[PDB]
Amino acid sequence: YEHVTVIPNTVGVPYKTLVNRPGYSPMVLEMELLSVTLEPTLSLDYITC
Amino acid sequence: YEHVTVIPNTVGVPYKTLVNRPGYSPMVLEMELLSVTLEPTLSLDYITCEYKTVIPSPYVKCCGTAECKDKSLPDYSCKVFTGVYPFMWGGAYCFCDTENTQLSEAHVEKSESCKTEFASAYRAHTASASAKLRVLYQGNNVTVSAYANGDHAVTVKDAKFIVGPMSSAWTPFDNKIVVYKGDVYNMDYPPFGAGRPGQFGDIQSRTPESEDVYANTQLVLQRPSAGTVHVPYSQAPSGFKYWLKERGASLQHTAPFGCQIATNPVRAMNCAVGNMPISIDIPDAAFTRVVDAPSLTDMSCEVPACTHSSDFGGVAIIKYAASKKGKCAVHSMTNAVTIREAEIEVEGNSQLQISFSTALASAEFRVQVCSTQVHCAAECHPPKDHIVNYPASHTTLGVQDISVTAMSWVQKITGGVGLVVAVAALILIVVLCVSFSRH
Numbered sequence A: 001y002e003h004v005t006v007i008p009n010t011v012g013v014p015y016k017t018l019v020n021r022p023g024y025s026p027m028v029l030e031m032e033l034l035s036v037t038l039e040p041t042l043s044l045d046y047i048t049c
Numbered sequence B: 001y002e003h004v005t006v007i008p009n010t011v012g013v014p015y016k017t018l019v020n021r022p023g024y025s026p027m028v029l030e031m032e033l034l035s036v037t038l039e040p041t042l043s044l045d046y047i048t049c050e051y052k053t054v055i056p057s058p059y060v061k062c063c064g065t066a067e068c069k070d071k072s073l074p075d076y077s078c079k080v081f082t083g084v085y086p087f088m089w090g091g092a093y094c095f096c097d098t099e100n101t102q103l104s105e106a107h108v109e110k111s112e113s114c115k116t117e118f119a120s121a122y123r124a125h126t127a128s129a130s131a132k133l134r135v136l137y138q139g140n141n142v143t144v145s146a147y148a149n150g151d152h153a154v155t156v157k158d159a160k161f162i163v164g165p166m167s168s169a170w171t172p173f174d175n176k177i178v179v180y181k182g183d184v185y186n187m188d189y190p191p192f193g194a195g196r197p198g199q200f201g202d203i204q205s206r207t208p209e210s211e212d213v214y215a216n217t218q219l220v221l222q223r224p225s226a227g228t229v230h231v232p233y234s235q236a237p238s239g240f241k242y243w244l245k246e247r248g249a250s251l252q253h254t255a256p257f258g259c260q261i262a263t264n265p266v267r268a269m270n271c272a273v274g275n276m277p278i279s280i281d282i283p284d285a286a287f288t289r290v291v292d293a294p295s296l297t298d299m300s301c302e303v304p305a306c307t308h309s310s311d312f313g314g315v316a317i318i319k320y321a322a323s324k325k326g327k328c329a330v331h332s333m334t335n336a337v338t339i340r341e342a343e344i345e346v347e348g349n350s351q352l353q354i355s356f357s358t359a360l361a362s363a364e365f366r367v368q369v370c371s372t373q374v375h376c377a378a379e380c381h382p383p384k385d386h387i388v389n390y391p392a393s394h395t396t397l398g399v400q401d402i403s404v405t406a407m408s409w410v411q412k413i414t415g416g417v418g419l420v421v422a423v424a425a426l427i428l429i430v431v432l433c434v435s436f437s438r439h
């Protein structure tokens, strides 16, 4: 059962989301962003020494 | 005690029936059709096969002219060609350069493959239905097989079953059918002895072992090439071989109602048309006195969750208080809702769970445990899967006005419009009364 949810991008703060499906008992998932990384693609221009 | 009921002819879908004999605890029987077979009566018109052209070695008459003979062979042809100068390997065959004739002659016959490779052209009169049924009786599955003509009652476990007759005479075979070996086709083959050349039926025979053969292949003899001792001819190619390539799709792949076709004998299996009248006779020893049966009071029913998903997508929980321990019949008194369970064990003060299938988006129905019924209702969600590999267990949604609760919107709008119309009519009639009093 695909369940799309949105949590704020804050790191280290747990967020509880409710996964509810008819015929099945509701499920709650506790999730917590441990780390988020942004990796720029670099195109070196020149080296200075 | 004898009971009669009618079930839809759909194969593989169980149905529940209620046997409410007065003075006894009601009994619920479940019957499911395992297979339904139609086997038409066949009369063999003729057979077709590949022909062979029998050519005797030509008679080349040296220094003279031969004469055409005559006989009654299937497609006998004879022609005398004059002016031939045939050559064999060692030199000319005829002494003189001319005044020679060749007596070419040929006929046709059944091949030797007609014992194995043939197509039978039948005439299907009428079907003799026969059904094999599985009935859940006394909490036991017992398989009952019998003819479906409404007669030929069969007895198992002291019960007497009579099944049929078919509610519909529909059959997937026309009057004229042909069977190759496993396939059957609905085709209108030519009359025996009137078959066209180069088409199915160019050579016919009453039986594969018969000797008399009709063959119309327009065999025409042709003039032999100069200096050759052959017998050329022009003939329409075998129509049976042409048919084999251009057969098309058999009845097994084109029949409606999801029919299945077999052979030896030819049958039509699982025709999903009509309904099956079935009558059951049960011994009095099977029933129980209503007093001796457990009695149930203080029944409450709730639906924790439900879904109209064609596969018992709903569950109902029923609380109850029982007089004594014993089996009890569960029956849904609403065609729109089908309940899987048939009988249940009941004891003390406890609760029991049942599963039901429905098409209503809002379920409202009365479940009748033995001798006592309870109202039940809840909302049904729609399922997520679009397609499934099995038929719907429940019946159709409903032939009439089974729209869901939250039709309260319809009630509200209709009531408001009716109130406005009633107010307008009242104003009209009061002013009419006032104006009619005035004079």
Ligand SMILES: CCCCCCCC/C=C/CCCCCCCC(=O)OC[C@H](COP(=O)(O)OCC[N+](C)(C)C)OC(=O)CCCCCCC/C=C/CCCCCCCC
Pocket: B397, B398, B399, B400, B403, B409, B410, B413
């Ligand atoms: C001044 C103007 C006058 C002009 C007159 C207008 C005439 C127009 C009409 C002609 C009628 C058209 C019918 C077409 C033929 C269909 C036949 C059919 O094949 O019939 C399908 C079935 C009916 O079965 P039957 O009874 O005939 O079979 C029993 C048969 N016998 C009775 C013989 C035993 O139909 C079903 O079952 C399907 C069930 C599906 C139910 C759909 C529910 C739709 C509900 C919508 C509600 C909207 C939400 C409200 C929200 C409002 C908020 C404000």
